[PDB]
């Protein structure tokens, strides 16, 4: 089964402002592992075109104890459905609030405009968030942090190549 944003979503996530980018993310459950493919394209704001000294962006998707998005704040729940704990990142392998645990990160280079001379690092962190006080907790999370420190891409549109990864599923 597949949990996804659809293959071509409308603006459906916030990197810096409401609906300022399209995240295409597909999670396919292959038994104990989730096979995933991801890319992002900024549609407005300070990453379209990249402006000033901006050299990073990020998005944290949080889910509740049933694997359901916590709310429409950051990824729009209208572009997020089956084609859910069976798609959540395994808490034994990627322990909640421990995104600094090396193994909870999958890190690789992706490329602006699909051009091999414009790398961008993508760090995906699984269950890396901790909520305290009054903050509603998430049970699970999946974070994408893009970073191109030291590269001057001003005037480019932040639009990445597509990238595949997998992770152990919670159930």
């Amino acid at each position: 089964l597949t949990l996804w944003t659809t293959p071509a979503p409308s603006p459906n996530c916030r990197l810096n402002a409401e609906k300022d980018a399209k995240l295409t993310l597909v999670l396919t459950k292959c038994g104990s592992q989730i096979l995933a493919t991801v890319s992002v394209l900024a549609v407005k704001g300070s990453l379209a075109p990249i402006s000033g000294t901006v050299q990073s962006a990020h998005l944290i998707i949080r889910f509740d104890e049933n694997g359901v998005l916590l709310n429409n704040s950051f990824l729009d729940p209208e572009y997020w459905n089956f084609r859910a704990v069976g798609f959540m990142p395994n808490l034994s392998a990627y322990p909640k609030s421990h995104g600094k645990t090396a193994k909870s990160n999958i890190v690789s280079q992706v490329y602006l405009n699909g051009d091999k001379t414009k790398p961008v690092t993508l760090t995906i962190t699984l269950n890396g968030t901790q909520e305290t006080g009054d903050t509603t907790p998430s049970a699970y999370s999946m974070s994408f942090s893009w970073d191109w420190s030291g590269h001057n891409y001003i005037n480019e549109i932040f639009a990445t190549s597509s990238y595949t990864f997998s992770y152990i599923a919670q159930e």
């Binding site: 704001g45 300070s46 075109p49 402006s51 000033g52 001057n152 001003i154 005037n155």
Partner: protein, 154 residues
């Protein structure tokens, strides 16, 4: 559509393709939906001849994209000295602020393009310009450790 072709040819650094298209009545002020114009494309990729053909055909020298970024921000940030000079000759605005208050001098300082930094200061660049966080080009020289830069800033 002559605009799209002109945007693409300026971006690709096709000097002649640009001349052919201008010849055929392409609008030097076309823009894409992010507000980039052909002169932003040429300033960013560093194609001097293209910058000149556009300015001669009436390209708005301080056109802003949707974030307030001008062609002189691009050429100063990315280090294209001779483009920075030609832009200035045509009325480029040394003190243009983008949407968070960043200026061409702030970017040329941040990325270490010192000769560009000197050129901007001699054209009246305001050194006390701060971004929306209160940081100036002198704060940059301290944060990024550039001693030559801090020296030049006085």
């Amino acid at each position: 559509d002559l605009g799209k072709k002109l945007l693409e040819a300026a971006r690709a650094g096709q000097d002649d393709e640009v001349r052919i298209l201008m010849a055929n009545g392409a609008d030097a002020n076309a823009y894409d939906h992010y507000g980039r114009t052909p002169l932003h494309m040429a300033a960013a990729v560093g194609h001097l001849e293209i910058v000149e053909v556009l300015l001669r055909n009436g390209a708005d020298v301080n056109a802003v994209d949707t974030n307030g970024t001008t062609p002189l921000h691009l050429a100063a940030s990315l280090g294209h000295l001779e483009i920075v000079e030609v832009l200035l000759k045509y009325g480029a605005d040394v003190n243009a602020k983008d949407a968070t208050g960043i200026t061409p001098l702030y970017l040329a300082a941040y990325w270490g393009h010192l000769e560009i930094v000197e050129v901007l200061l001699k054209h009246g660049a305001d050194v006390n310009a701060q971004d929306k966080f209160g940081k100036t080009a002198f704060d940059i020289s301290i944060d990024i450790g550039n001693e030559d830069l801090a020296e030049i800033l006085q």
